[PDB]
Structure formats: structure tokens, C-alpha cells
Amino acid sequence: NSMIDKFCDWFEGEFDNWTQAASNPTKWAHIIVKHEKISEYKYHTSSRYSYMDKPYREQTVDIEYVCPELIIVHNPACDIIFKWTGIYFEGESEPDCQWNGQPLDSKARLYADEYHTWDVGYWEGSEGFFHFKKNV
């Protein structure tokens, strides 16, 4: 209503997983995710350890709408395709998803005030789902 504008409302901002990290500091890094709006439907995305200024992960995305059901967070490296479930946006990487030469599988859940991400590399594997809460 429109779906893409609602997505962008939820998607934009700064998120961090303090509660997750603090609750098991030896398992989960404390990471800050920033989705900064450049233009309408254009965001600069980045992830950083909270004690660092420089992100370890960084790119710019276009937000595309594919009628009727889909929101695509687009980058040539890896599109993430979101569907509205009735409660949140559920996202999954396209098949050809790669970071920097490594096949990647990504999942994401976008809520009104949380962003959950799940990234798995062919060789490097994964830690599981990060739970990022959106900052005020």
C-alpha cells in the first residue's frame, strides 16, 4: 500500500544485535547494519563490527518491485528476493548469489523494527541467524 514503499520504510535505518551478542559474546559478534537512503529506492548498505568505523561488508542496492508479490534488493553480485508473508518480508538469495568468488546462500527476514539475516558460504559455512534490532 504500496508494498515497495512499506518495504523501504522498514528497510531504512540502523540496526544492531546487542542483545544477541551480549547474551553469548563468544558466539556472536556485535555488528551494526546500516541501510542508508541515497535516493528513492536506492540504499547504501553496510555491516561493521561495532568497535570499527570501517565496514567489512559494503555495497549499494536498488530496490525493485516485481508485480504482484515481489521486492528485489538488487545488486549484480547477489539479488535478494523478498515476498510479503502477511506478517513480514521473507527474503532469499537468487541462485547465482556470490560474494567475492564464493557461492553464497542468503536469507533475510524484515520486520517493522527488526532485521534477521542468515548467510552461508560454500567453504566458510555459517554461524546461523543474526538478530538485528532497529535503532530508534
Lookup: cell for 68: 504482484
Which residue, 84 or 103, is less far from a copy of itself as judged by CB? 103
Q: Which helix (H) or strand (E) holds 20?
A: helix 18-23
- Quick check: 59 and 77 in contact, CB under 8 A? yes
Quote the least distance from Cβ 103 to a copy of itself, whole Å: 11
Q: In whole angstroms, give the CA distance from residue 63 to residue 68.
A: 15
Judged by the rule CB under 8 A, the positions of this chain that interact with a copy of itself are 36, 38-39, 42, 44, 58-62, 74-78, 96, 98, 100-101
Shortest distance in whole angstroms from residue 65 CB to a copy of itself? 15
Q: Which is nearer to a copy of itself, 59 or 114 (CB)?
A: 59
Q: How far is the CB of 93 from a copy of itself (least distance, A)?
A: 13
- Residue 97 contacts residue 104 (beta carbons within 8 Å): yes
Nearer to a copy of itself, 34 or 116 (CB): 34
| Cβ 98 to a copy of itself shortest distance, Å | 7
- Cα separation of 33 and 14, whole Å? 6
The secondary element (H helix, E strand) that includes residue 32 is strand 31-39
Cβ proximity to a copy of itself, 49 vs 112, nearer residue: 49
